[PDB]
């Protein structure tokens, strides 16, 4: 066996007292070696006397060879279990879903499939290392939480976190030397035995069996965090049910694996694309100066917590800036300066990231993704730092607005962009109260039927879109020269690369028989392929390929027909996988999220306006009464605060009121009334004049007018923010038109 | 032929009028297609009528197949040349040294080797695209420079560059659409024919022949930029000699390729390591907070212009923070928090960059690499932006202070760290004027002989270092248990990974015969390997391996001896490759650079102190004379400046004097006397009081005292800055001792 360190007592008289520390990889093996050889100033801790190490079906073959397990044995009795070389096997995997969810899950499935009696009687354990450590100022011993729920509960009991620094250890390689010493000093109090319950068999069959339907049904919903009672019981008896592990960690790992290929139906982008968009918004906010692709990728990795390889990051950055006929992005996020790709190679002929540059399409991103609503979306947190939002909610349904296809395997995703005019008409009819077939559209939405039509986008396509049965076909255009006998292909079908199409024709002998030569003089955007045929071949070509209503004889000969198959599989905002049948369902699912976002924006604006009005009124009152109060004579802040409280001045938080970044409306109303009176003592000398008071009065008047406008907006029919939604739709349409006029180079 | 687009007239009556645009890759092919199909609003420009395209010995086989060249032909006559299908072949390669230096160089070598008459008579051309474009404000047409020397000469003639924006196009993929249109509008004025001269044959033989000695001799020196006369002649006759291209572009490409594996002898780090160190200094300057490896790599890529893959960046970041026995860095730049690697796998068992964190060893970096001297080193510029310095000059010879080895192939580099005490003694004896054997050391340096000894570092090595002949051998330590018959290896030789050593023993059958089992219970830092031998094997082992003075019988049996071979090949500061024989030569070469750096630091400090003294004296004079002058009554700045000039107030530059970042002493003395009188009108109201004047007088006194101290320092024997050098050496020694005491975790 390779990478196996046997214990001194393994396989001997005290073999049942031994342990086998199954390490995830090389880092886990290094940590285990450091802990086991630490037994110099550690009499109570473990050592190599009873603890062995191994690195994690050849690996499983080595595992069974070391443990001395028997395939034909059941280990239902103690005498049969005593033949094992080791008392128990302990898996040392990182707390991240990639390691504990996959490797430990596979090991548990293996053991359950072959030797379950070991699992029920107790043979498999796991190394539960502290997930989160909170260090105080002046206190050496930290507070350790094994789950994020426990840390959240503890932080709910903390008045302030200024004196506490929080460190997340999601991998075994994140533990420092003294932290490793601390964990291995209490090694016996940190191993957890796995147990089998009634639902464990069904969960194992679902997550590791050959039935894909059960797996898809189980993965339809999200991952539920462990209930505090379950966590408390686990910490109490030091036993972890297999069902809980399979339902939480394995499900999270599988959902994360799917989420890397399947986009959300609200914004149409995956996690990597959302990170790239957030990094682009943050990076180009100060100035829209051009930056190289690798520099922007480094910025995204540094700020947006993009821990994957830079190759995929650069590829996605290049794809987000591509703009050519048949490209994935009809409205790309970034303006690309340089050679970012051509339709002939399907965007695979892009320049090196060291040369091409990216810029933020501010006039489009600002309108499609409002900055005001960016403070209201739920954000994902990576090691306690605010990363990109969980999902973006654009003004228009960007999920169905662009060409989408999954190049990988394991999940089929393919969407064809719908027409901009049809989508705009549908959304405007839904939103506008004074619009034909508005009530009819709402009634149809309630009964889930379609009234207004949705058609595939015909932009950047000089072909023909036809409907046959329930399918949509795209036909390229060609012109034939009888005198020259050659055929000039002028337009390929939708999203058909030129080089791949030419090679596909060249790979067929039946078509190669009638074709003598193929030359590609197509421009960067316009296709022009000359196919020189053998003499006297038109009649033979017509006879070989009979003409039908579905397609022409030459169209069949040259394969100038493409089928628009759509696979509408998306990720729900609260986790899980959702399957749609038509784009109407996607639009109907996206609409309520945007309506709720508009309502939330209006409500938070109302709350912040009320707080600012209160602050300004208090400031004006203090300005008026400073002559009689004479607060400038006092020195201490406490005396001034007490006299202001006696006079009735309300206490407000300066920072939260003036900078309400990410505070929810209930949170904003909760913690804004426990501030101080700093806003009064911080007033400038020039601000005590009559002119400053008049300016503040004018500001109060304009803010009050905005408050009445917001209040009137909140009562708008059918839902609040309808006029704002229509205005933003008009702005987005204008930005899209301007981008299309200038080839998405806004100048 | 693949990726070949034939011209309409190629191989016909007008075949000699045709062209073959040899594209470097896919991006070049896309640019060529865009340019050639652009001929709609471009009657004068080229098109596919006479221009073909091809993608760049199978590729060369396709090239000769397309061109119809003959291997047995010489093409010495026009009639033989007329058989060619194309009139000429034009190479479209990016201006960067990777593309034009390698691919174009290989094509030129191919043509010279087989068909030189084509080269002399004129058959190979290159596409010379504008390297640098300067855009003015309000002027659409830019200024194009094909070489960096031309741009530098033009900028020397520019009074100000505020209205000019500079763009560098080092790749064919960096040209925008309108720029591509501009270049292809004047296509006939941008192709350059290659010519052969007398030295071309020798240069081709040197750079592409089988004689490695000639290549090494040629690469000993750096790359000389083309002289302005040569560039002017090239632009005049539109012909490029092959010798000039080989001497500049190919030499630069080869030197850059070598520089990625061979470190400088001044700081001991390559380009990537210098970029990482500069990024670490810049990133952790504000606060020394821990950052993840991938986040720091992204920061380095964004700011230090690291355009290579992130895998190598993360690997180098991890290596720079590793600290274990036998590691490459005896004094690592970064403190690593987490599991950064172990000696058992030779640092290959490091944790994932997503988990481990890095911090800047400020107490060591600040002392070893002074921040004051960081403004004086020559910096490399990447696309006009200031990247990491060309070379660092540490206080101590870091090139010989750490274990260095080149893991790649093509250049043999291996250095073994010398003892800290010996290096400190040598440098102190060189610097200190009152020191035994100081004059003797200087005399020996003049005669290039050694007096003080240099020995390999024995730190973190519980073995034996022995000297035999001119070689140094490292022996591990073992203990034998006769009763147990097993052998306990306690220390492996220097820089010998444990796993590799165990596998090497296991791979030999002769040693495997006497060994029954091998167990590795070694700690993270201490080696303890138990080798259980077969019964009655000590006598057989002794008989098989005879004992000699060089090594013991058991040492030969277990291969516990390592030879300390050193390959001292480095990169000179001004380019080229330098070969050393002993570490004394490296120290003697490094010393004058540090002495010159100290002298430059002292001189620039003197100049800036003089300028600041002049500024402060002028300010004090204005404060004294403001009562009579009454400058506050005036409104315009011009009138005040004129009256101050009449009164004799000197004009100084506020920004340059107060922030002399990277201004050389001659440059500082040149452009600091053409400023304005802003420093007088910008004075605060509170600064006109007597207390402010007294504070300024005290500041003037302290600055004058520092000026006299600097002046006395400049006259110090033997060279200026000797006491400063000794103080910095003492500080570096203290920092190294503190780091070694705390396992390079400064706390």
Residue numbers in the entry:
A (entry chain A), B (entry chain B): 415 to 470, 502 to 1192
Excerpt from the paper describing this PDB structure:
The viral type II topoisomerase encoded by the African swine fever virus (ASFV) is critical for viral replication and infection, thus representing an attractive target for antiviral drug development. Type II topoisomerases can relax supercoiled DNA by a concerted strand-passage mechanism in which the enzyme first cleaves one DNA duplex (G-segment) and then guides the second DNA duplex (T-segment) to pass through the transient breaks. ASFV P1192R contains two conserved domains, namely, an N-terminal ATPase domain and a central DNA cleavage core followed by a coiled-coil arm, but lacks the nonconserved C-terminal domain (CTD) with modulating activities reported in human topo II. Similar to previously reported topo II structures of yeast and human, P1192R assembles into a large homodimer mediated by two interfaces.
Interestingly, 3D classification revealed two distinct classes with almost even particle populations, generating high-resolution reconstructions with C2 symmetry imposed at an overall resolution of 3.16 Å and 3.13 Å, respectively. One state has a closed conformation in the C-terminal dimer interface, and the other one appears open. In our study, two distinct P1192R dimeric states were observed simultaneously in the cryo-EM samples, with their DNA-gate closed, whereas their C-gate is closed and open, respectively. In the open state structure, the interface of coiled-coil arms separates by ~17 Å, comparable with reported C-gate opening structures, thereby displaying an opening C-gate conformation. It shows that the conformations of the DNA cleave core for the two P1192R dimers are nearly identical, with a root-mean-square deviation (RMSD) value of 1.25 Å for all Cα. Compared with the yeast topo II, P1192R contains an additional pair of E817-R1046 salt bridge, which is retained in the closed state while disrupted in the open state. Comparison of the open states of P1192R and yeast topo II showed that the distance of the C-gate gap is nearly equal; however, the coiled-coil arm displays a 15° rotation between the two structures. In addition, we found that the open state of the P1192R, yeast, and human topo II shared a similar opening distance (~17 Å) of the C-gate, while differing in the conformation of the coiled-coil arm. Since no DNA substrates are present in the cryo-EM samples, we consider that the C-gate could adopt both closed and open conformations prior to reaction, and its status might be self-regulated through inter-domain interactions. The N-terminal ATPase domain comprising amino acids 1–414 was invisible in both states, probably owing to its flexible connection with the other part of P1192R.
